[PDB]
Ligand binder design. Structure first.
Ligand SMILES: Nc1nc2c(ncn2[C@@H]2O[C@H](COP(=O)(O)O)[C@@H](O)[C@H]2O)c(=O)[nH]1
Ligand SMILES: [Mg+2]
Ligand SMILES: [Mg+2]
Ligand SMILES: [Mg+2]
Ligand SMILES: [Mg+2]
Ligand SMILES: [Mg+2]
Ligand SMILES: [Mg+2]
Ligand SMILES: [Mg+2]
Ligand SMILES: [Mg+2]
Ligand SMILES: [Mg+2]
Ligand SMILES: [Mg+2]
Ligand SMILES: [Mg+2]
Ligand SMILES: [Mg+2]
Ligand SMILES: [Mg+2]
Ligand SMILES: [Mg+2]
Ligand SMILES: [Mg+2]
Ligand SMILES: [Mg+2]
Ligand SMILES: [Mg+2]
Ligand SMILES: [Mg+2]
Ligand SMILES: [Mg+2]
Ligand SMILES: [Mg+2]
Ligand SMILES: [Mg+2]
Ligand SMILES: [Mg+2]
Ligand SMILES: [Mg+2]
Ligand SMILES: [Mg+2]
Ligand SMILES: [Mg+2]
Ligand SMILES: [Mg+2]
Ligand SMILES: [Mg+2]
Ligand SMILES: [Mg+2]
Ligand SMILES: [Mg+2]
Ligand SMILES: [Mg+2]
Ligand SMILES: [Mg+2]
Ligand SMILES: [Mg+2]
Ligand SMILES: [Mg+2]
Ligand SMILES: [Mg+2]
Ligand SMILES: [Mg+2]
Ligand SMILES: [Mg+2]
Ligand SMILES: [Mg+2]
Ligand SMILES: [Mg+2]
Ligand SMILES: [Mg+2]
Ligand SMILES: [Mg+2]
Ligand SMILES: [Mg+2]
Ligand SMILES: [Mg+2]
Ligand SMILES: [Mg+2]
Ligand SMILES: [Mg+2]
Ligand SMILES: [Mg+2]
Ligand SMILES: [Mg+2]
Ligand SMILES: [Mg+2]
Ligand SMILES: [Mg+2]
Ligand SMILES: [Mg+2]
Ligand SMILES: [Mg+2]
Ligand SMILES: [Mg+2]
Ligand SMILES: [Mg+2]
Ligand SMILES: [Mg+2]
Ligand SMILES: [Mg+2]
Ligand SMILES: [Mg+2]
Ligand SMILES: [Mg+2]
Ligand SMILES: [Mg+2]
Ligand SMILES: [Mg+2]
Ligand SMILES: [Mg+2]
Ligand SMILES: [Mg+2]
Ligand SMILES: [Mg+2]
Ligand SMILES: [Mg+2]
Ligand SMILES: [Mg+2]
Ligand SMILES: [Mg+2]
Ligand SMILES: [Mg+2]
Ligand SMILES: [Mg+2]
Ligand SMILES: [Mg+2]
Ligand SMILES: [Mg+2]
Ligand SMILES: [Mg+2]
Ligand SMILES: [Mg+2]
Ligand SMILES: [Mg+2]
Ligand SMILES: [Mg+2]
Ligand SMILES: [Mg+2]
Ligand SMILES: [Mg+2]
Ligand SMILES: [Mg+2]
Ligand SMILES: [Mg+2]
Ligand SMILES: [Mg+2]
Ligand SMILES: [Mg+2]
Ligand SMILES: [Mg+2]
Ligand SMILES: [Mg+2]
Ligand SMILES: [Mg+2]
Ligand SMILES: [Mg+2]
Ligand SMILES: [Mg+2]
Ligand SMILES: [Mg+2]
Ligand SMILES: [Mg+2]
Ligand SMILES: [Mg+2]
Ligand SMILES: [Mg+2]
Ligand SMILES: [Mg+2]
Ligand SMILES: [Mg+2]
Ligand SMILES: [Mg+2]
Ligand SMILES: [Mg+2]
Ligand SMILES: [Mg+2]
Ligand SMILES: [Mg+2]
Ligand SMILES: [Mg+2]
Ligand SMILES: [Mg+2]
Ligand SMILES: [Mg+2]
Ligand SMILES: [Mg+2]
Ligand SMILES: [Mg+2]
Ligand SMILES: [Mg+2]
Ligand SMILES: [Mg+2]
Ligand SMILES: [Mg+2]
Ligand SMILES: [Mg+2]
Ligand SMILES: [Mg+2]
Ligand SMILES: [Mg+2]
Ligand SMILES: [Mg+2]
Ligand SMILES: [Mg+2]
Ligand SMILES: [Mg+2]
Ligand SMILES: [Mg+2]
Ligand SMILES: [Mg+2]
Ligand SMILES: [Mg+2]
Ligand SMILES: [Mg+2]
Ligand SMILES: [Mg+2]
Ligand SMILES: [Mg+2]
Ligand SMILES: [Mg+2]
Ligand SMILES: [Mg+2]
Ligand SMILES: [Mg+2]
Ligand SMILES: [Mg+2]
Ligand SMILES: [Mg+2]
Ligand SMILES: [Mg+2]
Ligand SMILES: [Mg+2]
Ligand SMILES: [Mg+2]
Ligand SMILES: [Mg+2]
Ligand SMILES: [Mg+2]
Ligand SMILES: [Mg+2]
Ligand SMILES: [Mg+2]
Ligand SMILES: [Mg+2]
Ligand SMILES: [Mg+2]
Ligand SMILES: [Mg+2]
Ligand SMILES: [Mg+2]
Ligand SMILES: [Mg+2]
Ligand SMILES: [Mg+2]
Ligand SMILES: [Mg+2]
Ligand SMILES: [Mg+2]
Ligand SMILES: [Mg+2]
Ligand SMILES: [Mg+2]
Ligand SMILES: [Mg+2]
Ligand SMILES: [Mg+2]
Ligand SMILES: [Mg+2]
Lengths: 246, 110
RNA sequence: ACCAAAGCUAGCUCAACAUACUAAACAAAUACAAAAAUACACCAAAAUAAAAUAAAACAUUCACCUAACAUUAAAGUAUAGGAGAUAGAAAUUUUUAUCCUGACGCUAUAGAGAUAGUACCGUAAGGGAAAGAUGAAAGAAUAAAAUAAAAGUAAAAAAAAGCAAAGAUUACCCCUUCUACCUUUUGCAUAAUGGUUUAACCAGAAAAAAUCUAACAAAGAGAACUUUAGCUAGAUACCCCGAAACCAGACGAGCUACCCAUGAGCAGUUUAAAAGAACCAACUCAUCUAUGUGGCAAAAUAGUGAGAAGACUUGUAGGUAGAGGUGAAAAGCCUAACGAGCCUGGUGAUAGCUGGUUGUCCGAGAAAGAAUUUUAGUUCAACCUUAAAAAUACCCCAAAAACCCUAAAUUCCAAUGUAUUUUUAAGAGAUAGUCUAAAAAGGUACAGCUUUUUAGAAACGGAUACAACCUUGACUAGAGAGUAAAAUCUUAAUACU
RNA sequence: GUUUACCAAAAACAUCACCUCUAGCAUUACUAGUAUUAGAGGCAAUGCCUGCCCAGUGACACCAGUUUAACGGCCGCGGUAUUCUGACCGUGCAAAGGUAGCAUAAUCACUUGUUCUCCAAAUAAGGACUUGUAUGAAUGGCCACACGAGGGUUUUACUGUCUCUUACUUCCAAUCAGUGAAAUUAACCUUCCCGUGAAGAGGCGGGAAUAAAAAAAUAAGACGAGAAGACCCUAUGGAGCUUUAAUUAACUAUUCCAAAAGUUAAACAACUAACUUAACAUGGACUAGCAAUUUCGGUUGGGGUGACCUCGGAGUACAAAAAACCCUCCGAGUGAUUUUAAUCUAGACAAACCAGUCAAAAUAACCAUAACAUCACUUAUUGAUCCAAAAUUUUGAUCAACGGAACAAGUUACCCUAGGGAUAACAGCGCAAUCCUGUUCUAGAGUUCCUAUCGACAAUAGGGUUUACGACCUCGAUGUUGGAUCAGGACACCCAAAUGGUGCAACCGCUAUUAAAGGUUCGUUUGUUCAACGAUUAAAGUCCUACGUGAUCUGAGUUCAGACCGGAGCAAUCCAGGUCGGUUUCUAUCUAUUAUAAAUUUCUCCCAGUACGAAAGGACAAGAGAAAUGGGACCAACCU
């Protein structure tokens, strides 16, 4: 412990304290850096490299439509809504090497990523989930043990609306009239022949959407999953059905 | 008391790179309160009278004849009053440039 | 051989459960001055906790702090703050019965304070102990049985000379060689601190980052997270005693200060007089001196003094209470310490200040640049330690670095002799300095003086003694050897006829 | 009469008396009172008195104005009577300019003012003089009776206080018997000297000494025991007190607005407002009282006072850099001007951090390949975060203690705690400026003549008394002035002895050498050491010893708590200022120590009124005696 002084007695001052000269961490001026950080949106990145590697080893299967829950279940990605993760974003890291044909749904995507999926004859769509929704979507089985109905999917807030309304982004709220046009525009720009998705045998799976108000595939807002009996329960009431279906 | 405020730190004026050293463009060669060393070839002068290298190379010091700019009154007067054989000398710093200016490479054979 | 020594029990501690939570005992007596059968009333009540402390001061602020809502997370996040110290949510999430209750808890200085809230100490509130050891049987005491080991003594006083020993020696001394130990310091044999001695007690505690070991690995974790080799687990860490104080609430006026009630004393002499007159007892004070100074006494004894019908002395019962009371102000007195009582609680107050800090051996190893209500302290550098990566590291010849005059010398660098240096990751101490040689400044061209710069040193050898001068790359054993520095310094002389 | 129970009994307090202020009144104080009363105070009976001032600060009057027996104040410079003075004159400033009295005082210093009285002699006491430029009139001024365990002085008397001690009793004491404590204690096998050393040694070095043990005595040392120094400083430690410190509540009174209860007109002019208020009593303000919370920046050759605290240039720091001082010297806290001086970025300087500095290329601006604002020594002309104002992009600190607490002063001798010999006062040590000694040199003084006696300007060396300087030992204590007692030592000799020189005739002297066995008085005043004075002496030495000596004494003085006076301060309090008063403990463990002698000096009488001298004067040696002191003894008488 040394000898006498403040240190041998155990009393030396707190951490930032410099001995009375104005502390370093306090002489520097305040500036928004971390300003409003808790409210920023966070999209966990997923490269085409990892997606391909996941398909190749048969963690996710390209056969059925790939959404967030499928990515989570393959542990290809990890989402923590508590940290304001709003979902997966698709990045182009493996674009040149990406040979798989998929129906994929992510919450953000880059032009190059999209192009890279189109070239192989698949379909990309950007969908939005609110925090509560997202939480339920990533970990469904713990939600079904909760004993609650399946909540409505919320809309995007005013900031994110212009993103999800554009066919540019293949937004889930976009006008499908614009889709083939923009989709072709991509193929002009990156110089590849755009396949006709219509004439494919898996096409029925490729067109599959969700309702903008719906969390899962083939379930509906307001149902209740009884997992011990392997039954679904649906409201017959008029008010309930009006509320959940609005 | 009578005497006050003699206390100020040293300015660290001096000569940073020495003859024969290697320098990269922008290195400060020397720094000074009055002109002691004058800038020579490839050596820029700062507004505080400090010398810095304009080219990558080797520092050399030299004595040379001093012919002041005719726009400078004082120096011209000093030169004009000299006896007819006399020549002002001063000490200069140069950088002998090391790398060749650039090279010619083969891009494409058409 | 005395004094002594040794037991293993009494009980305790922490949890679990649990019904549910003021035990036991009540014949009489108990709230008259508790323990006293019996007479016309009264009876009752509430007002935010504060401060010590942290902020290195202190003024807003300062978790917990005698108010049920737990748990896994969200999260030390949003927010709140002399926007400082610090403080700090929620939405939203998770939680499967009952039995398997005991103990890597203590064993008489421990564990409860406890054989006991008793003795004892306080007027009171309140404080608060110590203590036990035979055996199956003591309805086996001319008594039988296993330690005889602490300091203290006895058996047995001492015989020149010296930190009490050590080398030794046929031999105890005599000889030779060594300036107790801690702490504190620039420096201690110091005549600086502490200790009579013995036994028993008596003081380093935390896992953010890191390192080490291992699992699994683009993933890992028995949910909530983290991830561009990571994740998970384990292991590695940060003392003890001490103020004057401050705040709240109790208890104190049987001492003493001043009051209120109610009693009691004041003889002789002098005076028309009981006149804050006079002399002088009882009585009350406490002047001066000597004793006494662990005393007869935590304020007395002997003599000597001052008042002695008064603003006098004094008994009994009652009152005023600490931010207060009382005061013919001495800041006096308020239960032997009153510039503001005492006790309990806040409390393990807080101390940059002093003291202390417990096995062995080995590797390396530190004297100060900068800020600072700072110079008794911190936090940064520079050094240094432990790991780890590298590549140059000192040494360094020319050449080179200013203008009037200017020294010893610096800077910078090949070669060459060496093996060091730099980065990376961890980490503290230290930052109150002495003398010697040199360059200067101040002073008295004084200081064992003071302030900087370069160098050195801090022997178990030498300078008799010795910190700093000189010799000397500090290992173990030997009844070998060679060397080093080093031990008395010289002169002391004036005839001129 | 009262007071600090336990260091102060007093000049402090109270007090009769005299004065100010505040009140016109009812069931718990005052008071069962009613202004001839009752509270809050001042001052101190009596007597003579109580002068001038309302500018400041208070308090009344909520502003004017009034108040000093409210806090408090009460001056100069120049010129004048033949001369010192200054009735007079001039002029400045003030709210008034200290009046009467008293006065070297309990009154800053000068001060032991001057003079008279008292004493043989007085820094004492008393009486006068008195500018006290710092007295002074109810924070009272002057006389006075009586009184006082108050403080000073004289006379008588008395005495063991003293010269100068003595005898004897009792208690203690020592021995025997019984019982049986305390502080204390590293271990001790516990000598002396000189040296040394954390600067004062039983323990180190060099020497000396030395059978072992009790018992009784003394106190020089064990920096002896006691109490974590009360002095001093430090601590971002306390507390008490005072305010003109900074923040401001509650409470107590004032004033006001609102609340609450009301009341009036049906208002006025031409063709809604205003006013009211018994006691309670709420919310918000105002002014005071009484208070609450908190603080005393640092550096400093100890603190305090003074000075300083940031930035730059030169020296210190001679040639790369850096480099201190309460070191030596200059500066800065900005002007002036127009060339109004952009954006972005390689690489560097500097550097603990924060801050500072340069700068290529590239863009854009402009001649259409157009980026250093300039001058004043150019270097310095400056300030972080937060927070406030601005709205687009900025601005704001003698935050000058200049790395900056958002906002806080005094004082403590009533003090407290924690520490410090890191830092003062005492003593030691260092040093030797100051001080003291010698020698060296002679210009000069000495009628002439340097050195009989001196000796400027200077020189060399020593001593270690003084005042400092330094801060090295001691702050878990090294108790401090002068006396008393006992003295140990030096010699730099005051006396006694032996001599040299004289501007030595003799007697005196003045010098110098040698010598340390023995001596070195009694009184008046001062606390005093010094010093003055009276009387003497053979002489009344200079010093060292912790300014020897308090476990032997003293306590007058300094240095605690009380109190006056002058002064400073708004006050609390304060002054190297006076004055009165004020607790001085220790049973000895260790060291050390505890009786041989073998004189010393004066003065008489002779020597002789000789030697010597003009005379006045007047010796040495030799020789006889007496005393005194000191050492050692003793009672026949005297005396006790
Ligand atoms: N001048 C100045 N004052 C500041 C600043 N920051 C805080 N303050 C403080 O803010 C307060 C403003 O109130 P003030 O006393 O000026 O009326 C002051 O205490 C002042 O010292 C600043 O940046 N500049
Ligand atoms: Mg220590
Ligand atoms: Mg220290
Ligand atoms: Mg994530
Ligand atoms: Mg300078
Ligand atoms: Mg400097
Ligand atoms: Mg604090
Ligand atoms: Mg602290
Ligand atoms: Mg404090
Ligand atoms: Mg609190
Ligand atoms: Mg705020
Ligand atoms: Mg702060
Ligand atoms: Mg017990
Ligand atoms: Mg017990
Ligand atoms: Mg024994
Ligand atoms: Mg021996
Ligand atoms: Mg010291
Ligand atoms: Mg040290
Ligand atoms: Mg030593
Ligand atoms: Mg000593
Ligand atoms: Mg000793
Ligand atoms: Mg010492
Ligand atoms: Mg001591
Ligand atoms: Mg000792
Ligand atoms: Mg100490
Ligand atoms: Mg000490
Ligand atoms: Mg100790
Ligand atoms: Mg002791
Ligand atoms: Mg960890
Ligand atoms: Mg450790
Ligand atoms: Mg407080
Ligand atoms: Mg405090
Ligand atoms: Mg009573
Ligand atoms: Mg009578
Ligand atoms: Mg009488
Ligand atoms: Mg008596
Ligand atoms: Mg008598
Ligand atoms: Mg009597
Ligand atoms: Mg009498
Ligand atoms: Mg009388
Ligand atoms: Mg009573
Ligand atoms: Mg108080
Ligand atoms: Mg009081
Ligand atoms: Mg009384
Ligand atoms: Mg008084
Ligand atoms: Mg007093
Ligand atoms: Mg008491
Ligand atoms: Mg503590
Ligand atoms: Mg400190
Ligand atoms: Mg060392
Ligand atoms: Mg500061
Ligand atoms: Mg460090
Ligand atoms: Mg060279
Ligand atoms: Mg090299
Ligand atoms: Mg320090
Ligand atoms: Mg020194
Ligand atoms: Mg050195
Ligand atoms: Mg030796
Ligand atoms: Mg060595
Ligand atoms: Mg060696
Ligand atoms: Mg008394
Ligand atoms: Mg009394
Ligand atoms: Mg009296
Ligand atoms: Mg008395
Ligand atoms: Mg009086
Ligand atoms: Mg009158
Ligand atoms: Mg009078
Ligand atoms: Mg008057
Ligand atoms: Mg007035
Ligand atoms: Mg007026
Ligand atoms: Mg007179
Ligand atoms: Mg006087
Ligand atoms: Mg006056
Ligand atoms: Mg007055
Ligand atoms: Mg007066
Ligand atoms: Mg009378
Ligand atoms: Mg009298
Ligand atoms: Mg009297
Ligand atoms: Mg009296
Ligand atoms: Mg007799
Ligand atoms: Mg006996
Ligand atoms: Mg002996
Ligand atoms: Mg000695
Ligand atoms: Mg010896
Ligand atoms: Mg010896
Ligand atoms: Mg003694
Ligand atoms: Mg002594
Ligand atoms: Mg002592
Ligand atoms: Mg102390
Ligand atoms: Mg003292
Ligand atoms: Mg004091
Ligand atoms: Mg400090
Ligand atoms: Mg404080
Ligand atoms: Mg004020
Ligand atoms: Mg407070
Ligand atoms: Mg101060
Ligand atoms: Mg200071
Ligand atoms: Mg000083
Ligand atoms: Mg000094
Ligand atoms: Mg000052
Ligand atoms: Mg550098
Ligand atoms: Mg350019
Ligand atoms: Mg400062
Ligand atoms: Mg500063
Ligand atoms: Mg600075
Ligand atoms: Mg601060
Ligand atoms: Mg006093
Ligand atoms: Mg103390
Ligand atoms: Mg010292
Ligand atoms: Mg020191
Ligand atoms: Mg003393
Ligand atoms: Mg002195
Ligand atoms: Mg002394
Ligand atoms: Mg001294
Ligand atoms: Mg001493
Ligand atoms: Mg000398
Ligand atoms: Mg002459
Ligand atoms: Mg001396
Ligand atoms: Mg000196
Ligand atoms: Mg020193
Ligand atoms: Mg001391
Ligand atoms: Mg001692
Ligand atoms: Mg003598
Ligand atoms: Mg002599
Ligand atoms: Mg003679
Ligand atoms: Mg003598
Ligand atoms: Mg002396
Ligand atoms: Mg003395
Ligand atoms: Mg004395
Ligand atoms: Mg003594
Ligand atoms: Mg005095
Ligand atoms: Mg008296
Ligand atoms: Mg006195
Ligand atoms: Mg005594
Ligand atoms: Mg004895
Ligand atoms: Mg005795
Ligand atoms: Mg004769
Ligand atoms: Mg004749
Ligand atoms: Mg005789």
């Amino acid at each position: 412990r040394g000898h006498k002084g403040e240190r041998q007695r155990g009393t030396r001052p707190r951490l930032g304290f410099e001995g009375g000269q104005t502390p370093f961490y306090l002489r520097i001026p305040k500036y928004g850096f971390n300003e409003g950080h808790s409210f920023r949106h966070q999209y966990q990145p997923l490269s085409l490299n990892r997606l391909q590697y996941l398909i190749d080893l048969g963690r996710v299967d390209p056969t059925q439509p790939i959404d967030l829950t499928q990515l989570v279940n393959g542990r290809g990605v990890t989402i923590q809504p508590s940290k304001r993760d709003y979902g997966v974003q698709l990045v182009e890291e493996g674009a040149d090497t990406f040979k798989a044909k998929v129906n994929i749904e992510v919450q953000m995507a880059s032009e190059l990523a999209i192009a890279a999926i189109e070239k192989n004859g698949g379909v990309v769509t950007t969908a939005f989930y609110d925090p509560r929704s997202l939480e339920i979507l990533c970990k469904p089985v713990p939600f079904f043990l909760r004993g609650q109905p399946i909540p409505k999917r919320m809309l995007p807030p005013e900031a994110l609306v212009p993103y999800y309304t554009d066919a540019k982004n293949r937004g889930y709220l976009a006008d499908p009239a614009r889709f083939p046009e923009a989709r072709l525009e991509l193929a002009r720009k990156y110089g590849y022949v755009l396949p006709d998705i219509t004439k494919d045998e898996l096409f029925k799976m490729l067109s599959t959407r969700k309702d903008p108000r719906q969390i899962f595939f083939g379930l509906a807002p307001g149902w209740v999953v009884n997992m011990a009996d392997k039954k679904i329960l649906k409201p017959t009431d008029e008010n309930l059905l009006k509320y959940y279906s609005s | 008391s009578k005497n006050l405020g003699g206390k100020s730190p040293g300015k660290r004026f001096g000569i940073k790179k020495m003859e024969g050293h290697y320098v990269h463009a922008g290195n400060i060669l020397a720094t000074q309160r009055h002109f002691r060393w004058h800038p020579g070839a490839h050596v820029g002068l700062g507004k505080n009278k400090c010398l810095y290298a304009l080219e990558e190379g080797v520092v050399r010091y030299t004595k040379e004849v001093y012919v002041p700019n005719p726009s400078n009154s004082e120096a011209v007067d000093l030169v004009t009053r000299l006896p007819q054989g006399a020549v002002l000398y001063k000490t200069f710093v140069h950088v002998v440039p090391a790398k060749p200016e650039g090279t010619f490479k083969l891009v494409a054979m058409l």
